[PDB]
Amino acid sequence: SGFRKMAFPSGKVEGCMVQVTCGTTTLNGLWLDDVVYCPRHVICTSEDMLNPNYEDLLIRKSNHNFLVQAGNVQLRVIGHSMQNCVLKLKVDTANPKTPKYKFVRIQPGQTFSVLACYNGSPSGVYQCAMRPNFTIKGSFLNGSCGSVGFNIDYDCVSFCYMHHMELPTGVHAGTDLEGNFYGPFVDRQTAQAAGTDTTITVNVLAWLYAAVINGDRWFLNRFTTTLNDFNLVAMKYNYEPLTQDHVDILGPLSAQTGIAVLDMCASLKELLQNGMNGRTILGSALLEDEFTPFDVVRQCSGVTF
Amino acid sequence: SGFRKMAFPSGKVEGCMVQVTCGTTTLNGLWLDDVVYCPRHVICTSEDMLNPNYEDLLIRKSNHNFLVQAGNVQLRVIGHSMQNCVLKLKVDTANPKTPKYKFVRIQPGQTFSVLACYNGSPSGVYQCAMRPNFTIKGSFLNGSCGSVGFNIDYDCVSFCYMHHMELPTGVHAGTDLEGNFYGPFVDRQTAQAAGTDTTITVNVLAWLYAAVINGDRWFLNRFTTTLNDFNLVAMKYNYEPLTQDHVDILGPLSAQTGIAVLDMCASLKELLQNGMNGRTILGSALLEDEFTPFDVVRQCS
Numbered sequence: 344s345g346f347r348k349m350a351f352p353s354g355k356v357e358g359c360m361v362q363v364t365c366g367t368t369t370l371n372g373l374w375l376d377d378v379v380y381c382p383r384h385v386i387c388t389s390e391d392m393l394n395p396n397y398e399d400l401l402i403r404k405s406n407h408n409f410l411v412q413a414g415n416v417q418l419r420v421i422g423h424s425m426q427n428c429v430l431k432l433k434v435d436t437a438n439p440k441t442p443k444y445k446f447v448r449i450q451p452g453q454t455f456s457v458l459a460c461y462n463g464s465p466s467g468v469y470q471c472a473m474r475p476n477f478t479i480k481g482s483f484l485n486g487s488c489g490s491v492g493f494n495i496d497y498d499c500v501s502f503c504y505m506h507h508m509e510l511p512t513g514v515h516a517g518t519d520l521e522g523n524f525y526g527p528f529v530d531r532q533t534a535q536a537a538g539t540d541t542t543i544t545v546n547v548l549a550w551l552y553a554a555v556i557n558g559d560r561w562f563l564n565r566f567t568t569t570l571n572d573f574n575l576v577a578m579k580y581n582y583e584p585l586t587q588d589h590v591d592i593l594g595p596l597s598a599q600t601g602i603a604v605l606d607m608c609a610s611l612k613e614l615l616q617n618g619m620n621g622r623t624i625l626g627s628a629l630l631e632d633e634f635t636p637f638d639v640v641r642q643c644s645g646v647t648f
Numbered sequence: 649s650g651f652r653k654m655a656f657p658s659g660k661v662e663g664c665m666v667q668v669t670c671g672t673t674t675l676n677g678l679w680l681d682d683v684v685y686c687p688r689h690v691i692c693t694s695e696d697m698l699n700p701n702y703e704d705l706l707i708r709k710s711n712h713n714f715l716v717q718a719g720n721v722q723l724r725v726i727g728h729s730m731q732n733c734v735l736k737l738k739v740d741t742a743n744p745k746t747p748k749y750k751f752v753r754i755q756p757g758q759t760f761s762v763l764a765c766y767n768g769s770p771s772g773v774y775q776c777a778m779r780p781n782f783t784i785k786g787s788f789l790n791g792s793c794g795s796v797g798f799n800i801d802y803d804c805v806s807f808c809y810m811h812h813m814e815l816p817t818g819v820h821a822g823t824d825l826e827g828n829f830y831g832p833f834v835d836r837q838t839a840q841a842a843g844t845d846t847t848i849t850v851n852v853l854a855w856l857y858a859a860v861i862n863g864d865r866w867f868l869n870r871f872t873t874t875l876n877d878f879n880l881v882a883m884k885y886n887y888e889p890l891t892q893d894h895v896d897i898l899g900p901l902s903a904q905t906g907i908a909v910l911d912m913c914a915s916l917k918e919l920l921q922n923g924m925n926g927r928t929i930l931g932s933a934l935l936e937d938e939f940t941p942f943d944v945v946r947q948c949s
């Protein structure tokens with residue numbers, strides 16, 4: 344037993360991380376097959392970032408304007424192109440450590456592991472959720488740009504996130520690996536703020552299932568409810584609406600604990616309207632919403648990669 | 649900016665994890681150079697759980713009673729010895745993925761990453777502290793024995809923990825990589841319980857310093873305290889005593905924020921008296937005690 348915020352093992356991604364330098368900007372690249380992926384803003388100066396013309400800035404650049412370093416080894420860039428807000432640098436060598444991977448775009452509410460890197464050196468790994476407002480509550484310092492987020496499904500790495508910027512609230516914004524931003528953000532130095540955030544309902548329920556599986560049971564009760572009834576309380580408390588898709592996804596945890604989702608919803612309705620009355624769940628005084636149902640099944644059944 | 653429970657990148661440890669089978673028992677081992685380290689309880693049977701005689705069970709094994717698998721490959725055991733509660737199997741192949749490593753025994757309050765493994769394959773990585781009562785609050789299922797805890801400071805992996813068992817309260821006990829248990833525990837299924845657990849006071853102060861560096865000031869107050877009056881209050885909340893060593897260690901966070909260690913102690917006394925009043929600090933509605941002064945400086949600008 345026990346229940347922790349748990350990241351995927353990061354080894355398959357550590358072997359893909361490189362340093363990319365253009366002018367005075369150094370940040371991180373993802374080296375897969377014979378291509379290095381990084382944020383297009385690497386090619387920008389300070390003056391550029393205010394109103395950047397990336398098309399124009401990039402055609403001006405040549406292959407030797409990009410220094411790609413994998414440890415103490417220089418990669419030769421033999422091509423450079425842009426896809427949305429990601430730069431692709433073709434190199435003369437395929438990464439012999441390239442894992443089985445694909446590029447995936449995640450939905451708000453889904454979780455992933457971030458490998459925080461500096462100058463192409465992996466530094467730390469943590470579990471994040473894509474917030475309903477398309478920010479992540481990350482931990483990033485200067486030089487963390489191009490750090491990536493991923494899941495693992497068997498032996499396949501699904502890359503879902505690349506770090507581009509910090510917002511003035513301390514939350515973080517970035518793209519999928521095809522360069523499409525998550526959320527209404529742009530890669531220019533301008534005034535941007537996250538739409539007010541909301542709580543990921545189906546994840547709070549998954550965490551209450553993890554608590555019950557670990558013998559934290561005090562919050563259970565004789566009551567049940569309906570989606571409509573619950574979603575009226577949910578709307579009121581800035582919780583996401585709970586769909587029938589969400590109730591199906593919790594099916595496993597519902598059956599494996601003999602608590603039906605709407606029975607557990609009855610427990611959540613009461614926690615929002617009353618509080619925890621001085622108590623904790625799994626050593627939190629908050630309702631935790633960064634564990635998906637899959638996360639809870641994986642951690643409590645001992646799934647391996 | 650941002651503040652997160654952050655583990656070390658697990659790749660250097662992943663390439664060292666193998667599966668060790670003895671009899672019908674399978675758990676994880678750690679393959680470094682030409683040695684595989686694992687909990688010695690792998691050599692117990694169902695009647696040996698309470699009072700195993702390890703020296704007696706071990707002398708009855710040959711090298712070929714040990715099945716060691718590194719992915720698809722079977723390794724060949726050419727030797728076996730016991731050091732305290734750790735079994736060491738000499739194998740004919742050095743691990744080509746062996747990183748720079750050392751073994752270090754940590755003190756209560758220290759943090760490390762755990763690579764939770766099953767059948768020699770990694771499931772996940774998370775951050776832990778050694779509790780003042782020499783347990784860890786891990787996430788471990790049956791088959792996770794031999795999973796290790798580690799720090800990575802500058803390309804070198806310091807192994808500090810190997811998982812041996814779960815106590816009845818659901819907390820975890822294990823050894824250093826020399827096989828010496830943390831705390832008053834033995835590798836026997838005789839009834840054992842941890843001492844009452846306390847909060848790691850120095851770690852709470854480090855985390856309050858991190859909150860200030862990230863632009864939180866709502867919990868600060870105009871008061872200071874003596875070290876003695878602080879300990880008299882804190883202990884009434886099951887807080888660890890704060891020592892002058894603990895004060896010294898917070899020096900750099902004190903310097904970087906311009907808040908004195910004993911001013912921050914006054915803040916903590918007040919937070920204990922009032923709670924958070926529905927507010928949060930760095931995302932938590934509890935006071936977090938699993939970040940060290942060293943972790944806070946490494947993660948903070």
Ligand SMILES: C[C@@H](C(=O)O)N(C)C(=O)OCc1ccccc1
Pocket residue numbers: 829831832833834838840
């Ligand atoms: C560290 C450990 C030890 O004696 O090796 N220790 C101090 C300890 O009290 O472990 C519990 C125990 C020891 C002997 C008999 C029953 C239970």
Ligand SMILES: [Cl-]
Pocket residue numbers: 753754755758
């Ligand atoms: Cl230590």
